[PDB]
DNA sequence: TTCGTAATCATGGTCATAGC
DNA sequence: GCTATGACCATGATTACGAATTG
């Protein structure tokens, strides 16, 4: 056969392969049943980082001609794109962000198409596009266009020389200095004036410093991000719990750092430890306290509190009576749809900030006596699960948990 | 570059190395007919049923495959006419002129183009009739076409009722496609432009693909 | 004008019809000719929005339209149904048109004529000819079926004609090919309307130099020069190549009723119509009934294993046992030989002794009523006779008596009284024969050619594939052509779509179906004692109409991923659905992440798949009833016939039920139907478990409870038999599955076994089970060795039987025929089954002693053959074909049989089957460890001897043998510590 | 479907290199 | 200083292909 619809879907197929990303799944799965479809129909078929290259770190001599600086910040990456839906670095995880930022992206995407990709640098629940790479045109338009709807971007540099460039750190220091942007700082990101190919430097040493001990600080609501002090009482930038896990550091001794010229930086942990994950988790978690567990890549409370979290999870004043919560949640009529359109465990999950599988493996270990829609008792079967102290605390803070579901059980009721 | 003895006509086979592997059986394949075969005059003549044999193997991607040779005047490379008279390969001619936008033309051989091989399936047919020598050629056509499939990434089958039962034909599962009939009603082929197809397929594989302008001669 | 049908087929020109053979009383043949359209099934406005008006259209009626796509939902608030009634129309048209908004398009346009027109594919009907126009000699035309085809008339007799076939071909080395090796000789079966049996054979004489035609020409036989001077009533004919052929499509291009022949379609029909293309230039011809439509003989393929087919349009079926056999029945080979000799068999006595040769003697009071009238009959045209699976005998002299036959065979005195008889393999070298080529060996093989067409006439009365046929052309709406070629996804269609319209319903699939994706093994594999079998009575459909399980009545399906909302779930499941209205049956997750998945029938109104499985159910029981009471051979026949029909769709269900493109596919029933089947049977095995007998109570290790829901039934354990007050009885439950249950009992008088089974089966009948499960006692089996169901040996003695009868020596797994082991390995194999079974039988065993027997029996036996050698070569003698179709670089066994043609004169083709074994030189001593055994192959020609410095390599053969031997027994340490000390090997169990 | 034989891989050690 | 981990070794193990059970 010789149908058109038959060469428009290669074509379609084709696009899809051109546009593949791993993350994703929605497309991942409608391209994979195209393969198996095109292998029934016609018995066989032909089915980050890759315009980066490796960081440079030595004094050297550039090219003369035009160049586009960009500075990269500490944080970590994210990705999105079109067709797709948000995505990031491995876990494949997802976050809650308000549609007027995805109505900016759509503006984007269908605007210009020669877009490859949104990339944004996270840190501290303060997000930032940093820069992206466009195959059409000079990456000027989106960022123009983007601090043309209101959000911020960063203070692009062009420099045309017409003689050789030596890139030293001294130069760094003064570009960096130039910047002036208080905000903690990585690299420096420069682009040719026709090539696609992007590059970047980072200039950096090793030296050793001793630190002193790890606490905790506030991000946000409940958000808690730990940092190590130092000697000289400079604040340390943890990147995330995960960072500080793999790190492995040891108290009361001495680290390698990689320092810049005004920051000291804790790299990875590039030794040769034996030491496994079991007692070291122990070791920390009784070093930070019994309320602390390891929620990803924060942290969080165990207090007990109770009624104050739903009101700041359905985005209204303080209340005081469930009588007079269930009115004031029937006379907002923005609400009921969030309430409806979602299930109640989950609800009473995410309102108390708890990991999905840690969770639900340790829910799926217990054995529950409720009565009336109402969980009255429970109790605990295995011990191994228990061997993770996040479990533990968690189970000890079941018996908040119990009044939260009760409670929002009765307020669902009650509302129909 | 090598050559072999057969007992019957045209008692020696002159080939190409890339046919090495598995042509030696052939002949234990031919001695068994070749008996039969000289009985009727054959299209071509005995001397041109292994021209075809000198094309290599090593630089070919997609593969066009016919049912049975022209009944007159067939010089053994296939889908070809040193006097441009043949239906079939004017319609192919129109196809790619009409395909690639070229509107002049008067030559037009499928050896010329670079990663595709003219073949048929049966090497024989005495004229006056259509594929009268199946049962003749059957397990040379199985050995051929298997030994093809080991190097082409695509195959084109030219035929409705012919090549109907291709699926059990090979045994390495490669990607078919099957054309229409070279005289279908309601001039079918004039609606077909499989080449694109072919093309796009070969896409999906990360492939170097085909230019048929080269193919025409002016 | 009274037709009773016979066959139904197709036209495949420009325009296409519907033709019907049929046959009058007196013996007429008469083609009727309908046209053929293309059906469809529409709503009414989709009918009144057909700009062109479709051909005719016929008013359906009130439909009601259900959608019974599954969703899966996590709450407990269901949607329900949508259904919608509105009138349906059917439209019938000549061209084949696409309609978007069609249904019922999953059924064929033949299912559609005959439900639409109302005619049975074979009933006999009293046509009208006032709507049948002559329109050549011996067809008829008609266009309006309705009316025609009115009058029912009850089933009458009408004679039929056959054609059986066999082909012997001239071969050396290889198998034979169309183009350097002839046709020697040619058998024929022929029965005419007339009812006369013809039997004829013949044979070329281009290998039978003069002196041998005039020989057998003055010795009988007959010589013919041209096509039209043979006459059939003639057994031998003498002739060439030529006129063999010519004669062959003579016969073939005839308009019989049945030609059938055993793998006929493979071999012998394409090789008759190669050859006689080749010869000449000669076609066989096959013309419709109208006379407008001819073709050619080209067998053609399907994929099913492999196969083929006859493009025929004359109305002639042509049928081919092997095809049929590897269908209908699970058998551990498919040789004709072993279907003939696990066919016919009888018990024979012996009626004189000495000399070389014996006589048998077998009648009705012997063996069974009708086995002695059979093997009689089969022994017309035999020569060689099997008995006691060892000794093959050629017939010296026969006879057949009033009710019985007596035999001489020329065997050894072996000094016993009673033997079985059977026929079998032939201890024939045709390649042998070939070579020196007589009139007395032309004359044998065409006796041989003779018996092996009879063979296939014998096999055809024996499975009544007649009746088979018109039973299930009359039960799956089906053309008799049709029957035995597709799988059970196709022969559902006609009483599903029946059952539908009587209904009024529709079912819909709206949206594209996903991709979703147990053995069961004995306690012990020797018993020592009885073993005791119960069947279960058809327990899936059974189990369907139990629980209702059908695509529309399923009312939802509930998943939970975590246990608080699994146990709040089942808490609104007892609030909302409460038995016995609605069932709710646990499943297992469809998904990784979900832990816990509850589907939920209804059972207010009966299903679809229900009321099928009933029906099905219900005229089986009502088939059997009436065979029970018949009196005619004939009806006996078509009831069985029926019955077995009714047998074999009933159980197709289930599967169809899990097949994706089925018409009945649903997960959720199929899924509900397995669980609840194993629960079934764990609840029955576990109160059958440790029952005991004492005094006059019975006591169960459980409760009688039922396992769904609480019933009003007792459920007392301790139950009152009517058995004698002295039995002292205890039971085991050891195997069970969906088919049967197995139960130990400590005894080996099989007479208190038969009635203790009779009387357990109904008290549990009428104690323990419930609503509508049943089962019924089967047999007793004596030394049972097993596996599983696949591989076992045993004594099994039939439910009507008495300590006084013939055991049935039942074995099966094991193969016999596969043929690249050895030959002392069969023949040691089958002595230590012997002695396994020998010993088995003392009592006085337990467990762990046997398992030692075995091995210091195989250690002596090993001793002694390894250190006498005394073996012959033969025995050890391996085979295998070549051929160059090999993948991979070098495969050695090609590069072995390259230096072998290049080391000596004789050479291998590309099809020859060649021997080879294992060789090792003299000097090295028994070994352990072992290493890459292909470079020990070695070819073994006809004038190849052991040389003095070589010998066999004992210790792969030994090694096999042991773990065939180990794969047996119960005992497991001792068994890998043997393992360990004879080849320091880790043996490969189950 | 089973049965058989290579090939690959992972749970039992050992030792050369190398770190608190 | 010994004890720690990389490249080396194999017993015991599942996973893989092969090719017959075809006629």
């Known amino acids: ?369 409720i009565e009336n829609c109402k969980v009255v008792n429970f109790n605990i079967e295995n011990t191994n699960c228990l061997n993770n102290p996040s479990i533990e605390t968690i189970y000890g803070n079941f018996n908040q948990f119990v009044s939260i579901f009760n409670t929002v059980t009765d307020v669902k009721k009650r509302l129909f | 570059m090598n050559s072999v003895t057969i007992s019957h006509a045209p008692y020696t086979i002159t080939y190409h190395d890339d046919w090495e592997p598995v042509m030696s059986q052939l002949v234990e394949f031919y001695n068994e007919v070749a008996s039969w075969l000289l009985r009727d005059e054959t299209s071509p003549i005995p001397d041109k049923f292994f021209i075809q044999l000198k094309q290599p193997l090593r630089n070919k991607r997609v593969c066009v495959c016919g049912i049975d040779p022209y009944p007159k005047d067939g010089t053994g490379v296939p889908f070809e006419s040193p006097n441009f008279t043949k239906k079939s390969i004017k319609e192919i001619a129109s196809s790619i002129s009409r395909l690639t936008g070229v509107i002049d033309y008067k030559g037009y051989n499928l050896n010329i183009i670079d990663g595709v091989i003219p073949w048929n399936y049966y090497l024989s047919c005495k004229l006056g009739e259509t594929k009268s020598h199946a049962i003749y050629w059957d397990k040379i056509s199985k050995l051929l076409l298997q030994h093809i499939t080991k190097h082409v990434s695509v195959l084109y089958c030219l035929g409705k009722t012919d090549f109907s039962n291709i699926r059990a034909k090979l045994e390495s599962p490669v990607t078919t496609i099957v054309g229409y009939h070279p005289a279908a009603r309601d001039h079918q082929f004039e609606k077909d432009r499989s080449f694109e197809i072919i093309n796009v397929l070969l896409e999906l594989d990360n492939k170097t693909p085909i230019n048929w302008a080269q193919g025409f001669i002016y | 004008m009274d037709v009773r049908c016979i066959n139904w087929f197709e036209s495949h020109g420009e325009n296409r019809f519907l033709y019907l053979k049929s046959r009058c009383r007196n013996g007429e043949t008469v083609f009727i000719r309908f046209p053929h359209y293309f059906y469809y099934v529409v709503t009414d406005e989709i009918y009144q929005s057909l700009s062109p008006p479709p051909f005719n259209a016929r008013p359906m009626g009130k439909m009601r339209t259900i959608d019974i796509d599954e969703t899966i939902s996590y709450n407990l608030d269901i949607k329900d149904r949508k259904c919608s009634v509105a009138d349906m129309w059917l439209i019938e048209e000549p061209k084949k048109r696409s309609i978007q908004n069609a249904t019922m398009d999953e059924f064929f346009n033949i299912s559609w004529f005959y439900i639409s027109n109302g005619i049975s594919p074979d009933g006999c009907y009293s046509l009208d000819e006032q709507y049948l126009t002559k329109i050549n000699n011996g067809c008829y035309h008609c266009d309006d079926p309705r009316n025609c085809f009115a009058k029912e008339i009850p089933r009458f007799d009408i004679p039929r004609s056959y054609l059986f076939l066999a082909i012997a071909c001239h071969f050396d080395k290889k198998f034979p090919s169309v183009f350097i090796n002839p046709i020697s000789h040619t058998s024929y079966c022929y029965i005419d309307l007339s009812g006369k049996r013809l039997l004829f054979t013949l044979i070329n004489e281009e290998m039978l130099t003069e002196q041998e035609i005039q020989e057998a020409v003055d010795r009988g036989c007959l010589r013919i020069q041209s096509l039209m001077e043979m006459d059939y009533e003639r057994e031998l004919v003498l002739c060439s190549e030529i006129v063999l052929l010519r004669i062959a499509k003579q016969l073939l291009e005839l308009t019989f009723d049945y030609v059938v022949t055993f793998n006929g379609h493979n071999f012998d029909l394409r090789y008759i119509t190669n050859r006689l293309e080749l010869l000449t230039g000669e076609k066989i011809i096959f013309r419709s009934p109208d006379k407008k439509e001819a073709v050619h003989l080209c067998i053609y393929e399907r994929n099913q294993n492999t196969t083929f087919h006859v493009n025929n349009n004359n109305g002639t079926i042509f049928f081919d046992l092997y095809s049929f056999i590897q269908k209908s029945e699970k058998l551990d080979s498919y040789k004709l030989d072993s279907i003939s000799k696990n066919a016919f068999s009888c018990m024979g006595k012996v009626l004189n002794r000495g000399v070389r040769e014996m006589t048998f003697i077998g009648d009705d009071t012997t063996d069974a009523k009708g086995k002695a009238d059979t093997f009689a009959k089969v022994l017309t045209t035999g020569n060689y006779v099997t008995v006691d699976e060892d000794i093959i005998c050629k017939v010296i002299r026969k006879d057949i008596l009033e009710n019985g036959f007596k035999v001489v065979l020329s065997c050894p005195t072996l000094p016993n009284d009673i033997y079985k008889l059977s026929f079998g393999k032939d201890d024939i070298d045709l390649a042998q024969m070939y070579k020196d080529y007589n009139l007395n060996i032309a004359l044998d093989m065409a006796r041989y050619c003779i018996h092996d067409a009879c063979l296939c006439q014998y096999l055809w009365e024996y499975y009544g594939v007649e009746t088979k046929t018109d039973a299930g052309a009359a039960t799956y709406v089906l053309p008799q052509s049709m029957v035995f070629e597709y799988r059970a996804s196709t022969i559902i269609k006609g009483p599903l779509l029946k059952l539908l319209l009587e209904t009024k319903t529709i079912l819909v699939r709206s949206e594209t179906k996903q991709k979703f994706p147990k053995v069961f093994a004995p306690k012990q594999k020797m018993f020592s004692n009885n073993v005791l079998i119960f069947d279960y009575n058809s327990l899936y459909p059974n189990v369907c109409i139990f629980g209702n399980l059908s695509p529309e009545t399923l009312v939802g399906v509930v998943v939970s991923t975590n246990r608080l909302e699994e146990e709040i779930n089942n808490q609104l499941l007892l609030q909302k659905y409460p038995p016995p209205r609605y069932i709710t049956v646990h499943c297992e997750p469809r998904l990784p992440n979900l832990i816990s998945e509850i589907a939920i029938f209804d059972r207010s109104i009966e299903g679809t798949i229900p009321r099928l499985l009933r029906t099905f159910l219900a005229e089986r029981a009502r088939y059997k009833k009436m065979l029970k009471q018949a009196t005619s051979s004939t009806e006996k026949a078509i009831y069985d016939s029926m019955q077995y029909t009714y047998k074999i769709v009933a159980n197709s269900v289930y599967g169809l039920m899990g097949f994706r493109n089925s018409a009945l596919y649903s997960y959720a029933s199929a899924k509900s139907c397995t669980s609840i089947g194993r629960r079934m049977i764990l609840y029955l095995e576990s109160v059958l478990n440790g029952a005991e007998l004492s005094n006059g109570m019975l006591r169960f290790a459980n409760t009688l409870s039922n396992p769904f829901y609480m019933d009003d039934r007792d459920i007392n354990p301790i139950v009152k038999t009517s058995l004698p007050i002295d039995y002292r009885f205890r039971f085991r439950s050891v195997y069970g599955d969906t088919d049967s249950v197995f139960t130990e009992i400590d005894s080996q008088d099989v007479d208190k076994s038969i009635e203790i089974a009779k009387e357990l089966e109904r008290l549990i009948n009428s104690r323990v089970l419930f609503n509508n499960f049943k089962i019924e006692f089967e047999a007793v089996y004596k030394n049972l060795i097993m596996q599983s169901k696949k591989k076992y040996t045993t004594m099994k003695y039939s439910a009507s039987s008495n300590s006084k009868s013939v055991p049935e020596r039942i074995n099966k797994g094991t193969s016999e025929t596969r043929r690249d082991v050895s030959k002392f390995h069969k023949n040691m194999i089958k002595t230590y089954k012997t002695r396994l079974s020998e010993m088995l039988s003392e009592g006085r065993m337990n467990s762990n002693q046997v398992c030692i027997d075995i091995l210091r029996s195989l250690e002596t036996d090993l001793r002694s053959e390894f250190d006498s050698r005394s073996s012959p070569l033969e025995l050890f003698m391996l085979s295998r074909m070549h051929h160059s179709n090999y993948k991979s670089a070098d495969n050695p066994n090609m590069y072995l049989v390259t230096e072998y043609n290049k080391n000596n004169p004789e050479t291998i083709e590309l099809g020859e089957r060649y021997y080879f074994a294992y060789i090792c030189p003299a000097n090295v001593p028994w070994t352990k460890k072992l290493v890459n055994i292909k470079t020990y192959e070695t070819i073994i020609d006809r004038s190849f001897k052991l040389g003095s410095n070589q010998r066999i390599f004992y210790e792969v053969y030994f090694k096999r043998l042991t773990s065939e031997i180990v794969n047996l027994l119960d005992n497991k340490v001792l068994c890998i510590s043997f393992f360990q000390r004879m080849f320091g090997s880790r043996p490969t169990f189950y």
């Open chain 1, 1 to 369: 056969m010789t149908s058109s619809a038959d060469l428009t879907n290669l074509k379609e197929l084709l696009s899809l392969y051109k546009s593949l990303r791993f993350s994703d799944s929605v497309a991942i799965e409608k391209y994979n049943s195209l393969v198996e479809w095109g292998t029934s129909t016609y018995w066989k078929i032909g089915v980050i980082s890759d315009y980066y290259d490796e960081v440079k770190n030595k004094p050297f001599n550039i090219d003369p001609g035009y160049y586009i600086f960009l500075p990269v910040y500490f944080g970590s990456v994210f990705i999105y794109s079109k067709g797709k839906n948000m995505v990031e670095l491995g876990s494949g995880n997802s976050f809650q962000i308000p549609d007027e930022i995805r109505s900016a992206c759509n503006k984007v995407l269908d605007s210009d198409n020669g877009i490859d990709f949104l990339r944004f640098v996270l840190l501290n629940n303060r997000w930032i596009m940093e820069d992206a790479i466009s195959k059409y045109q000079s990456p000027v338009n989106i960022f123009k266009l983007a601090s043309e709807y209101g959000l911020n971007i960063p203070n692009y540099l062009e420099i045309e020389i017409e003689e050789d460039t030596l890139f030293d750190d001294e130069l760094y220091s003064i570009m960096e200095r130039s910047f002036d942007d208080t905000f903690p700082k990585i690299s420096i990101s420069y682009i040719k004036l026709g090539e696609l190919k992007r590059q970047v430097v980072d200039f950096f040493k090793f030296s050793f410093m001793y630190i002193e001990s790890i606490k905790v600080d506030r991000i946000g609501d409940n958000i808690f991000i730990p940092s190590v002090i130092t000697k000289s009482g400079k604040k340390i930038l943890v990147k995330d719990v995960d960072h500080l896990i793999r790190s492995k550091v040891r108290e009361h001794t001495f680290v390698k750092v990689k320092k810049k010229n005004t920051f000291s930086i804790l790299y990875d942990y590039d030794g040769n430890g034996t030491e496994t994950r079991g007692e070291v988790i122990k070791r920390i978690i009784d070093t930070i306290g019994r309320d602390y567990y390891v929620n990803g890549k924060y942290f969080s409370k165990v207090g007990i509190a109770g009624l104050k979290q739903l009101t700041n999870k359905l985005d209204i004043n303080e209340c005081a009576t469930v009588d007079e919560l269930v009115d004031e949640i029937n006379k907002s009529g923005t609400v009921k749809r969030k309430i409806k359109n979602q299930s109640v465990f989950d609800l009473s999950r995410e309102c108390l900030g708890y990991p999905e599988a840690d969770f639900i493996t340790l829910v799926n270990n217990m054995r529950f006596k």
